[PDB]
């Protein structure tokens, strides 16, 4: 509970509660929970927000997306997750959510947890909220929150601007008339499609029948406007813009930033950014244009033109007229010009490039299926009926090699690492790159070149040394590996458990494209309640008991 | 020679020639034979005009380019040509020029013709320049043009538009630091890469350095100038434009076209738009600039913004100052808004696919190396020892494979081909197509997308025969393939040749894309002549007795 953000200053929260307060190691005490419960259900020939019908969705209380979760920074979040899907396994995974010291609630299955079973298996989970900020939860299992399976939290706290209006969250996704299994398989062996759409805060229009409507936001003339817009897609990476308005960026990903002005943002899958919008130009019907750059190397949309429309309040209806002007091509970019309000600094020089630091990412074309995605020589592979946190508590420390296990037992030390993007392969894509349980700092990367343009760059230090960045550098939870290059990230050990790290594209994980940070292991056993450790038994017993009466293959990394 | 050919009434010639005549049914008689001399040789760390030094050259008289060839509407061209290569053998193609009936002199090594051995190799080729207007001619001996066996040709003639000054050829190239043969090598496990800069009429600024000079025409204010634009390169494709100027197209390959005045024009490897520009702006100098559009999914280059100055004659100096706006994103596809002055008429109102009709293209990825492109089942590759031709002339007809062989028995008829790219392969890029010994007509093609958005479309009568077009559709030698998409096109069979009809780019044909029209084979051999045919064995000869002597192996087509 806030007892001093007001309109005229959301940086104050509470009473010793701030802006400034490093959220990371102060939370409020609140002894508040916001409770929810998913109820999970496969819709089969579903008429979608654009017209058309779907073959099958995986739908949370019967909507496009689940409950929105709004809980104030110090809560606890608790959420009911029954899974009445006909086959499939689920696991919700809290997008953003540190998860300091319950790993067991972080809904990667195989990693973390069994999934719940199908037609009526159950879970609690519980997290508490020491982030404020914006952002999401979906399934893990496999590719099915591109099915439906997903939405966004609002923990509200501090801003690093005051603002009269908090529009709240306003989701992005690309949007298939495919269903999800269809998709994965058919990615094994062929380019991504462009999406059939890309859906904005759960609408839009069909470029081909015209059914549906657009996203329909109402600004209050003259007010400034917190929107909170977020990239949910499977694949699709972003630009956005607002006809004839700036946007200023108060916080990327649930990390809050120095003020910020732009004309147009890129956000990657997963990303999010918030913004505040200043109505303060002619009273009208502005587009809100969602467009694309980067060559096509990280996504685009079979509707030329994905828009919603901003509409003063009191000017009159219909739609806008000035198509505006294309932005900047981001080029699958993220911005790397944003500054965290609370610093973080540590050292760009000592650098050596060592097989202990580095995660070498490749294409592997030689096998089978065609498109097969590899960390440091393995495709992950988890078990879902095994994940790493049974061998944590039953003390086997011989992972398999498809677990991708990254073994780090530095206590509270800046680990730093090197993601290299197939320098060698046939060709190199853009990745999002996201990070389970943590932040990490963006210390560097590679040139920015056009994204499809082939180049290839292994980091140096001789030259790239002198391009890190060690000073309040980026802070958030995904961000760009380079076509052809590098990303040179640093997370914190401050958090024991099995914290995955993958790119964020639904058929790359899906494909491989996974690590797994085998954080503090030993810390880890002992920070376990029995409840969890007791629970985790009982969901994974039960998925075990389900598993082998499966009708479908698992025929992918499972993630 | 032209007898009435003048400024302010291009379309004359001489009695009875005319922009109106069908220059494939009628030629001036003017006894005329322009003679040239290629002389080829091998340069070892040779500095090219943007001030970098390539490993390797292989010019034609010591210069970056060959003869500019230049002759009337009518004439003969004879050209010997001495290979003073170390270890390839050459053989020149005068693409755009269709040698009716004179099918040996195609230049098709392989098909047509042996290599012409190296080491002071030695062959005259004569062909009669029965069509006016902008070509080329190159290597074919696989992808040899790349490092410079490269240059153009001028038959001058009528015109479609009256205009004052003739600038002549204009020839645009992507430009690579890397050798042709080490760049196939490459390109048969990765994708092609961005060129490191583009040359205009020969020259280029490098963009790291400034060294070089910008290609730099001067214009005559207030006169009509004409342009012979040229796509000379071994895999980019290029959008061109003139900032605060207009371009009539008064010609496309060698057909000329009624005017049509564009913005901003695109040329694939192989294409020629010859446009009239009309210095009526005011006195300045104007960036003539090279973009690429469509997603890269059909050429890029390092250097940022290739560009030549336009300088109007009394204008200061130095550099253009207004850079100007994108030209429209081309999306890899050629303009079919085109129409020829002579027509020709077929019917579109009644086809079927059959599989003699229909060529099927596939990149296949199953076998070594990576990248084997596949028209019908089989990637092309011939046999620079034993050419169709010497199969035509030993009556052998049991032609391999790997040939890719298209009999076409019919007298002077429409044939209709169509080309299908891959609509279930993995993923599809456009591909210039070129037909050798003819123009064809472009019936037409899948309907018009983003080159990269990822669709795929079958031909289909209930739809697409409303799409083609048998009223004068562009007639010419080059044009676009859709990517995943179709093309179909039709030529008459009016001159019994082998005739390649393959994709453009260097790393493709090198890959195996080609098929070979055997056309009226029966007809074929009756028309070689004693010399032609004696000529034929002897360079066969000399190239049978030194190919045991190469001390590389071929890699590749062939082609
Ligand atoms: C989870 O959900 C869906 C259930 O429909 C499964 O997807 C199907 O997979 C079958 C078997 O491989 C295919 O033949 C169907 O085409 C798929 N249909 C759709 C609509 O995707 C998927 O197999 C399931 N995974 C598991 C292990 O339960
Ligand atoms: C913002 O979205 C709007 C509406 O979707 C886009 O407007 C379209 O513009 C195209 C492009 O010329 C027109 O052919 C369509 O008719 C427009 N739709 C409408 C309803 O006006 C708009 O172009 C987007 N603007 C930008 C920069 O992308
Ligand atoms: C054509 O000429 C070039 C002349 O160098 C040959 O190219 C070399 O090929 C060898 C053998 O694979 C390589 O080691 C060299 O690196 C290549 N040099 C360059 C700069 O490309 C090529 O083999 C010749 N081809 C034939 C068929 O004789
Ligand atoms: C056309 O070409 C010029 C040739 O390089 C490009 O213009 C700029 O080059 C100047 C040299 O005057 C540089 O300062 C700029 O960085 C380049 N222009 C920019 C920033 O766009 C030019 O852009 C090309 N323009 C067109 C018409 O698209
Ligand atoms: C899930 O929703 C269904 C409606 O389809 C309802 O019948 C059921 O009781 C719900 N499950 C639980 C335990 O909430
Ligand atoms: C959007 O909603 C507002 C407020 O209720 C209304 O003024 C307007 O009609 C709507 N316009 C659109 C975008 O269709
Ligand atoms: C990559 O695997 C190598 C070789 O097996 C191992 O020595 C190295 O430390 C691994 N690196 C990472 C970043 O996990
Ligand atoms: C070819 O050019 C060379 C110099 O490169 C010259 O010596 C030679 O005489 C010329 N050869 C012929 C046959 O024209
Ligand atoms: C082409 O370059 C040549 C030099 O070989 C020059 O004489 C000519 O005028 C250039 N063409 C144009 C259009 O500038
Ligand atoms: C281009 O040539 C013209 C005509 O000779 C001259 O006026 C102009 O200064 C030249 N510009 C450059 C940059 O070389
Ligand atoms: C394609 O291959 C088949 C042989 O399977 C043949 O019947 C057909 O004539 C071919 N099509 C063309 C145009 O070559
Ligand atoms: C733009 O995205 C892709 C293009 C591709 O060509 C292949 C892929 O996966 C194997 C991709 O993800
Ligand atoms: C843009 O062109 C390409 C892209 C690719 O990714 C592979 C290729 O194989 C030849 C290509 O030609
Ligand atoms: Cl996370
Ligand atoms: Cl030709
Ligand atoms: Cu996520
Ligand atoms: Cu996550
Ligand atoms: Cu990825
Ligand atoms: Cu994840
Ligand atoms: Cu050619
Ligand atoms: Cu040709
Ligand atoms: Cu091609
Ligand atoms: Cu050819």
Redesign the interface.
């Known amino acids: 509970e806030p007892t001093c953000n007001t309109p005229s200053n959301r940086a104050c929260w509470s009473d010793g509660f701030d802006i400034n307060t490093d959220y990371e190691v102060s939370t409020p005490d609140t002894g508040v929970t916001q409770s929810y419960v998913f109820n999970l259900t496969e819709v089969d020939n579903w008429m979608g927000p654009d017209g058309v019908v779907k073959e099958k969705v995986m739908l949370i209380n019967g909507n496009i997306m689940g409950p929105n979760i709004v809980a104030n920074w110090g809560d606890t979040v608790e959420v009911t997750v029954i899974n009445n899907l006909v086959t499939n396994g689920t696991s919700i995974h809290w997008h953003g959510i540190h998860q300091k010291d319950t790993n067991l609630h972080d809904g990667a299955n195989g990693v973390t947890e069994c999934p719940i079973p199908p037609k009526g298996g159950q879970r609690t989970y519980r997290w508490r909220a020491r982030q404020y900020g914006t952002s999401w939860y979906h399934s893990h299992f496999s590719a099915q929150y591109g099915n439906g399976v997903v939405g966004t939290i609002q923990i509200n706290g501090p801003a690093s601007l005051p603002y009269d209006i908090d529009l709240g969250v306003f989701p992005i996704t690309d949007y298939y008339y495919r269903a999800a299994d269809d998709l994965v398989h058919f990615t094994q062996?062929?380019?991504?499609?462009?999406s059939d759409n890309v859906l904005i805060n759960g609408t839009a229009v069909n470029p081909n029948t015209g059914e549906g409507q657009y996203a329909n936001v109402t600004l209050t003339p003259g007010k400034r406007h917190r929107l909170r817009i977020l990239n949910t897609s499977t694949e699709n990476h972003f630009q956005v813009s607002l006809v004839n308005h700036t946007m200023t960026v108060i916080a990327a990903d649930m990390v809050p930033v120095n003020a910020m002005t732009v004309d147009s943002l890129f956000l990657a899958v997963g990303q999010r950014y918030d913004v505040v919008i200043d109505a303060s130009r002619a009273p009208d019907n502005y587009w809100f244009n969602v467009t694309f750059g980067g060559?096509?190397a990280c996504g685009?949309s079979?509707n030329?033109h994905p828009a919603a429309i901003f509409h003063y309040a009191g000017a009159p209806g219909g739609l806008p007229t000035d198509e505006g002007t294309p932005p900047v091509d981001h080029q699958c970019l993220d911005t790397l010009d944003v500054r965290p309000v609370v610093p973080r600094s540590v050292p760009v020089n000592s650098f050596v490039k060592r097989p202990d630091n580095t995660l070498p990412v490749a294409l592997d074309?030689t096998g089978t299926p065609?498109?097969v995605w590899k960390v440091n020589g393995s495709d992950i592979n988890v078990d879902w009926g095994k994940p790493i946190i049974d061998y944590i508590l039953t003390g086997n420390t011989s992972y398999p090699v498809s677990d991708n296990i990254v073994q780090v037992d530095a206590v509270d030390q800046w680990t730093y690492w090197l993601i290299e993007n197939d320098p060698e392969?046939?060709?190199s894509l853009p990745h999002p790159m996201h990070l389970h349980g943590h932040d990490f700092l963006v210390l560097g990367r590679s040139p920015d070149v056009?994204a499809?343009?082939?180049?290839r760059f292994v980091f140096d230090p001789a030259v790239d040394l002198a391009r890190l960045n060690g000073d309040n550098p980026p802070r958030r939870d995904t961000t760009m590996l380079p076509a052809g290059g590098w990303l040179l990230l640093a997370f914190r050990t401050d958090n024991p458990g099995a914290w995955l790290f993958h790119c964020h594209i639904a058929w790359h994980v899906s494909g491989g494209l996974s690590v797994d940070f085998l954080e503090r292991p030993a810390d880890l056993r002992q920070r376990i309640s029995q409840e969890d450790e007791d629970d985790f038994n009982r969901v994974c017993d039960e998925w075990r008991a389900y598993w082998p009466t499966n009708p479908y293959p698992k025929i992918d990394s499972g993630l």
Request: no cysteine.
């Open positions: 062996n062929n380019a991504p499609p462009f060559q096509a685009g079979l030329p074309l065609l498109f392969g046939p060709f056009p499809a343009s082939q180049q």
